[PDB]
Design a protein around this ligand. Structure first.
Ligand SMILES: CCOP(=O)(Cc1ccc(C)cc1)OCC
Ligand SMILES: CCOP(=O)(Cc1ccc(C)cc1)OCC
Ligand SMILES: [Co+2]
Ligand SMILES: [Co+2]
Ligand SMILES: [Co+2]
Ligand SMILES: [Co+2]
Lengths: 336, 336
């Protein structure tokens, strides 16, 4: 394999691999829908209030050592690159933007062909998002169980955009249903190297056999929902469905498990947090903020020390939070 | 009933009823999806090509006498009020913007309550769309057969928004399935006067019994797809499913039929045309433009003279294209 320039695109421009530092690979400034933030900002109180909450949150994460976050918000998750650039500059935290499609694509997207979708992803990566010139540094895709026909087209287009640019692919999965396996099958059918792929939401499942099997093939495993837990919220149907009833310690231990299995170079950790959330029931953000007041600082403030306490070498934790993200994000073209 | 000031909101500001003039009540500058035009303008060649196409088309309509069009494009149809204002000023054609929801709502909308939706519609009507200050002059809703639970919520919120502001409601229907009847039931259960409602795409059915019954109740009947015909394009499945196999003369004669039944004041006619179309198969726009090169001028150039030669009085035609639209669009509050 070869590189493209040894630089990673952020909403403030390109940065060197060394500048990325401690990186949270799966985060959101706002979980919404295309055009929603600009059409109904009052849903989040106001755009200004959302930005300020994001800035406060990112500063606290930065204080705990976080220097970069990857906002995996796609077009259909309502990604607003202007908001990202604004909060990034105010908080002095690098933010890598994404292209791709989540599981709520509109008609204008759902009817497109794989070639058309491939051009859209390439546009956002090479030309820039909208008319901002801000280039995406990662491709986001997803499935909720077996891939629908359209989702298959999306993953293929993601693989092609990836092979052409060197930008990695990260995914949302229904961990329990072992989605990672079908996703891997499609990606490989397109010639994409597993090292360019992160199977996300893997901590949503306790099946270590499924995880280690994917890791053995070269895929990066995303344990990105560590703080998700509805324990003590059994009475909240909606919160329970999204967060699950497994403790954050349970999720965190999968990190230690994979390390023991010898897959430390293939682990990526994150919170899957956000500061705004309109694509779900109202006030879910409030419920979430009560579950995890640390927000994005949860990983450095509670997960890292937890792992260290239970035997994981500090050096190994540095490798997972600094070295793996850097190697993953560095635009990398396959050997021709 | 009562007036709110006797002025209609357009993307260029409020105009007097007499300024409206010849009005096409169901049109689109571009049929897309929220955020789609801003993120992938190349799909339409470019934003500039799209705008120039709209300007050329609007000037041709204007040349034929059209002074105002109602763009019933909602948030989820990709409504871009900035584009509307730009083409309106360059073509010097009044454009009334819409709020409401079509049948492609994203998650951030689909999960909202009737109360929340009611606040969104009111925002767009009273405060304005996004941060432009441009206020919607009509509310658009839709169903395609029996109403889904969310759709029932949309209709109720649309009714509440209309009752509080005086702004009319216009609908998309699967005419052949008589959607109009259920829409009316929901509207009346909220206390909305039938005179504030236009049951659209009614020319899509040949069941005059269904149309006359609704007209007898006070509803306005939208015969807005007159030029839609896939005749001669039998080998084009997608074009046939959307355009139908009935001639434009057949659709147009429904205008005469309703007039003969004594419902001239209940009729509103339009083309349901657009200059860009991304929420359907690729190149459908090219197919449509061949079918009807007159675009929005189809009504004044072909339909009006056609009805005139079938015995319809010129004055009755003026009442339909000038008087009815004005009566319909003028904000009207129910008697205290
Ligand atoms: C290897 C030295 O760690 P680091 O480069 C980045 C770093 C800080 C905090 C945590 C919990 C992990 C990693 O130090 C910050 C200046
Ligand atoms: C008396 C009504 O005519 P009008 O106001 C508007 C109007 C123009 C064209 C056609 C086809 C019908 C109506 O004439 C334009 C100056
Ligand atoms: Co996800
Ligand atoms: Co996420
Ligand atoms: Co319609
Ligand atoms: Co329409």
């Amino acid at each position: 394999s070869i590189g493209t320039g040894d630089r990673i695109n952020t909403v403030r421009g390109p940065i060197t691999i060394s500048e990325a530092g401690f990186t949270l690979t799966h985060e959101h400034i706002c979980g919404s829908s295309a055009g929603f933030l600009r059409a109904w900002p009052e849903f989040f109180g106001s755009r200004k209030a959302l930005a300020e909450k994001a800035v406060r949150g990112l500063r606290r994460a930065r204080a705990a050592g976080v220097r970069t976050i990857v906002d995996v918000s796609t077009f259909d998750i309502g990604r607003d690159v202007s908001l990202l650039a604004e909060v990034s500059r105010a908080a002095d935290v690098h933010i890598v933007a994404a292209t791709g499609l989540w599981f709520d694509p509109p008609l204008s997207m759902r009817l497109r062909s794989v070639e058309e979708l491939t051009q859209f992803f390439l546009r956002e990566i090479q030309y820039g998002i909208e008319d901002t010139g801000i280039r995406a540094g990662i491709i986001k895709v997803a499935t909720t169980g077996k891939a629908t026909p359209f989702q298959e087209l999306v993953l293929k287009a993601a693989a092609r955009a990836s092979l052409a640019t060197g930008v990695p692919v990260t995914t949302h999965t229904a961990a329990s249903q072992r989605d990672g396996e079908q996703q891997a099958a499609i990606f490989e059918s397109e010639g994409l190297s597993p090292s360019r792929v992160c199977i996300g939401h893997s901590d949503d499942t306790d099946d270590l056999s499924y995880l280690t099997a994917l890791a053995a093939r070269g895929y990066l495993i995303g344990l990105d929902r560590i703080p998700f837990s509805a324990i003590g919220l059994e009475d909240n149907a909606s919160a329970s469905a999204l967060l699950g009833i497994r403790s954050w310690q349970t999720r965190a231990l999968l990190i230690k498990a994979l390390i023991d299995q010898g897959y430390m170079k293939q682990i990526l950790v994150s919170n899957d947090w956000l500061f705004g959330f309109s694509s779900y029931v109202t006030n879910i953000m409030d419920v979430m903020d009560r579950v995890n007041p640390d927000g994005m600082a949860f990983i450095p403030l509670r997960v890292i020390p937890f792992l260290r306490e239970k035997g994981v070498p500090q050096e190994t934790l540095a490798g997972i939070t600094v070295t793996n993200p850097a190697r993953f994000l560095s635009p990398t073209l396959r050997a021709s």
